Amino acid sequence: VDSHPPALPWPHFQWFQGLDWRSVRRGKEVYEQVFAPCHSLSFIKYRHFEAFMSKEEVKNMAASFEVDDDPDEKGEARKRPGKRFDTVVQPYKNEQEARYANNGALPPDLSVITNARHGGVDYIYALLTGYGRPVPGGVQLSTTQWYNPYFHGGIIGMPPPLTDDMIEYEDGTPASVPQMAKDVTCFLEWCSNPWWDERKLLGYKTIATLAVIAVSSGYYNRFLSGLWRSRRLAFRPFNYS
Amino acid sequence: EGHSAYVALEQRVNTRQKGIIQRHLSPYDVDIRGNGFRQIYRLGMQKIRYFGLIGTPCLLVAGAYRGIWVFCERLEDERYWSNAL
Amino acid sequence: QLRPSRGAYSDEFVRENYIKAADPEDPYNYRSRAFTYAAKIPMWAGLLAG
């Protein structure tokens, strides 16, 4: 079996705490500038970004791309700048094309990736910061194969995607490999579960309300049981010699 | 309720009852805390003793299974570490 | 012990462990009625909100 990812303290795995949204913003930056051409987000739309980005920024980002439009009056195909409601641009036309651009490998869709792997967020982090290790003995690596101990089998077809100072963050934080890995993992956690904070909040409210109901109903049950828990019996004796 | 199997059973088996006196207090005259701590203690002790009794065979068999589990787990670890798979 | 004449508890026991302490200023259990209904209110409130 392969390496078990370590369990790391994530800010959203904490008491009374949710997504950082700063890591999410920075991970969006890394997504735009690094793995947008290779991996796809089939479930994320531009309007979904109106959660950590401003409305006008989302509008400009959407208009920065081109999307298919209804055919011309003569039936000719058309292109059109994107809008809020359009799904983000696919990187490849069809699987074959993808497999051709990655030397036979098919980069999966990352829309629910943290939910699709054992120990999701940790795994992804452990996957990205695990690429430079020495190759084990007796292992033959092609020119398009790399040793990552966390991938299933130990050999992966994804070239090391992260390098130091590759991305210039807007907020000034240095973009080292662990930092960028943390940010993309937070962004992909948001992509998989865009309902993290609402889920936690509803959980707290429901548990509190059920606790109130439980206390009151428990008192009333104890009260009603009093009639029977104190019952008394007496048998009139017989006439025995 | 009168046409039920348990009512039929009680009519067949039990006699016509006589000489039974029952006393009930309304719950408004009964304290919910009245017999609380004593019952907590007694029931806790009873359940401790009873589970100590009926849990012993399960404990013994679980100990034997734990021995077997440890043996097999370390055997398989040794097998994997020596490329004997 | 094979010819029973009583249940589980003797009157004395019940008089010492279940019956509330008397309140000579309140001979109609208004206190108990008020407390029970007020303590029921939260259950109804939670159920309605839910």
Next chain:
Amino acid sequence: TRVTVVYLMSQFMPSKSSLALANIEVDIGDIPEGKTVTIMWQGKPVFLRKRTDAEIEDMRAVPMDALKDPQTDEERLGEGRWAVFMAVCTHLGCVPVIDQGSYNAYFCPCHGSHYDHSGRIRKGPAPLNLEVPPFKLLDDSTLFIG
């Protein structure tokens, strides 16, 4: 009642369209010896190879223990001169490329799997062998895959 039960049951039988793609017939004369040809059947790619005697001898020399998935040529591939395989790597999903393997046979480059001319996995992470469709040897000028 008999016919009605038969009819309600027949509402759950395979659709005619699925019975049109069930079987295919591929002309085999045009393929010379020592050539591997890829075709499409049920979407699955299929490798047809006009296996020669050297491959038969080499694979018969292969024991029944050194193979991760123990199979023999007669056990899995009755047709001595024709090898029909499902061109899909068992470990994850990739198309084994023609030749380029350590056994002069099928090679999956995604993570480096090696399948001999018998389709049997020898090295790599593949847990099984290439699927063999229940192909049938039709007349000497065609082969019925299905």
Next chain:
Amino acid sequence: SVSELKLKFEEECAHHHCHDIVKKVEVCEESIKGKEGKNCLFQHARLWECVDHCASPKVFALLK
């Protein structure tokens, strides 16, 4: 940069908390030399699982 600290922490953890695993993987490296169809994937996976238990969290605390 944090990458240099990461490498330093990995070395420290490997040589202070997984020394027995290091010795074992060195032992198994010698065994497979010459043998055909044998690799040290399992042993190296165990080594890098042991190392990252201690090295990885520390680095994870040095980044914002």
Next chain:
Amino acid sequence: NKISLYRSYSTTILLSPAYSLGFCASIFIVIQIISGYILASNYIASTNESFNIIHNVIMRELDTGWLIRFNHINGCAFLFIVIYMHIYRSLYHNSITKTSVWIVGIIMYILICGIAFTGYSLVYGQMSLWAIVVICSLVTAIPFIGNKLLILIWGGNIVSSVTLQRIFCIHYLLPLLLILFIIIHLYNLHNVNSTGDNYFINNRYDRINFYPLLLIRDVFIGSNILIIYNIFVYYYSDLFGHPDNYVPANPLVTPSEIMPEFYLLPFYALIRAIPHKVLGIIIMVLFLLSLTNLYPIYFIRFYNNINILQRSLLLLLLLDLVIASKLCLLINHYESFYLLLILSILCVLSHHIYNTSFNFSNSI
């Protein structure tokens, strides 16, 4: 006539809080029915739209479609947990004497297993597809008419859109039959009444009115178990599942380990511990049929009491079932666990539920 409402049904006073498990199971049946009806109103069954319409439409286009889906999943898991506790209590208190109630309960259990399996099949993911494939490979081992049978089950040589559509119809239909069987369950129980902690024959003076005391106790226990349930819905939403079901189905790739849900694992063990496929099928059928009480019919049989040895053996049965589930999952990589798997399965198959008074007799 409120008085006539109070006295319409009376039970024993020995109904400890352990006797609300039926009410908890009813709560979870209601939750599953409502959540499933809401999900089906947004569901399309096909190999091109199913997986997408769950993760891209249900969970991202509605306000709380994700919450509805998590309710459905964790409600299934907790329904099975509560039903297992219900069965264990029934065995502990020798409730097999309630013959009608027991038979209807076993029917309901088999039906619920079927419902859970067919529902898990609807998420056209990797685990769903390959669990279908493995179970159908079990099907095709029937002598003579197996292969044709398999085709009729699948409508083809592979799992396809028609297969998903028929599975969806089955998943929709069965829970309503389950509701009818629950009604029959309760009707029989009210005909024979509840055992309680100890079995006594009580006249009306020793019994108490069911309403409203036991309804209030049921509300209290239900609120507590709903707290426990919602802890999983909002904070452990994916703990009762396998991540490979978030990967869309790939008929060309098989997962590393195919594992069913935790509540079906024991059955899976019965298939891994029996090398012969036909023998495994026969033993599974005999296991299910033997849980019932349909034989003897016209031979005089009555039921005696239960004792401490039997209760301890029941605990042992629980231990053996848990060990068998874990080991049947573990045997894929480690082959030395077959010993303990087979040992636990044999121990499970040799557990006495009913003490045969026929054990003791004399020969002619």
Next chain:
Amino acid sequence: NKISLYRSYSTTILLSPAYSLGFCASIFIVIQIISGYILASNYIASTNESFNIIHNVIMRELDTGWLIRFNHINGCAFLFIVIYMHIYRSLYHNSITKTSVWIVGIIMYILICGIAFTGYSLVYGQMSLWAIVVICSLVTAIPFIGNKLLILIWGGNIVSSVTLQRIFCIHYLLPLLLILFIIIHLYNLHNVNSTGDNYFINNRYDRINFYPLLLIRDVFIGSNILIIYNIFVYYYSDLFGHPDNYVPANPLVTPSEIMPEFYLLPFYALIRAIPHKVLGIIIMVLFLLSLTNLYPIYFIRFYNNINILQRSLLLLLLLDLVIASKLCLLINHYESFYLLLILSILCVLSHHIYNTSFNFSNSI
């Protein structure tokens, strides 16, 4: 005890063949359930591929999917024909006295009307789309919530795949509730027995065993009715339908005439004969509520006999309903028929089912 089977239930000897209409209705309910379950196992609800999978996949790829679909359509039509004859008979023999049976019957009639409508909606054709549009526009007239409620019902401003999915789930669900209500219908009937040609209070020496005589009569009448029903399934397969429903729906194009199915036309007439929308909705609700017998509740009421005058007026009711349906559909091109439509509706609304003894009394 075969004898105990014969005597389990006994009825009157005056059961003419007209008293098999309930059995025929049950036959067509069974046919609808089975054919609908077979259709639903090949159905995808979505505006993109609904009309296509009915006409291209179900009908042309299965062996006899066409026959299944024709069975379903003509079974709906004949179920309504038999139910109308059933109601007409029950009005003729003064069966409003069977209070529980009558009320359950009216509830079942409303349910079946809903089932038929939601089913017709699923064929995403021109007629289906625009019938939905018209009905939901009638919903829009409710005071202070017509648009909020309409949006909630449709899931948007326009009929779409989510609307089709809601309709599919409701169409699947309702017939099972209908089966439960049929069970209750028969339970009540067995409690109070049947009327026959005339009403008599018979002791056991004047009653006959229900089984097998009336079962064989039911088989005979059902065989004849199935012959008549199959003359339509195989030779007039679209006599009750409208050709515009064989056109895929265009939301941009409105059909020349929007006509519902022949068993809803009377209701449609009530809508067309009342210019004010709110008044039309009120009249519809009052009509459906006045078909029942839920008032008076605690005032003493009893039912007397029926006479030739009432039977003649019953014939007049039938005539008025049929003419109203035909005219309601004709008025789209011929404005002068509004007079006759309104006249027929007025004659219908003032028909006396129950002759009230409160018609005669004195004043203080």
Next chain:
Amino acid sequence: MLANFSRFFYKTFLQSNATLIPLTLVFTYXXXXXXXXXXXXXXXXXXXXXXXXXXXXXXXXXXXXXXXXX
């Protein structure tokens, strides 16, 4: 204890459903729906405020403006 207060409270609110129902509605609204629910909401919003979506958006607009001035 509190005999007089108990009598007063019972006679005022609890004796009639015409007042007990309004009392329980008041309890539902002012002490469950705007006291536990809204209070937990406010507490959650307050704890996690340095990482808030609002905060992120504000900082983003600020930085965008700052970058546009170059």
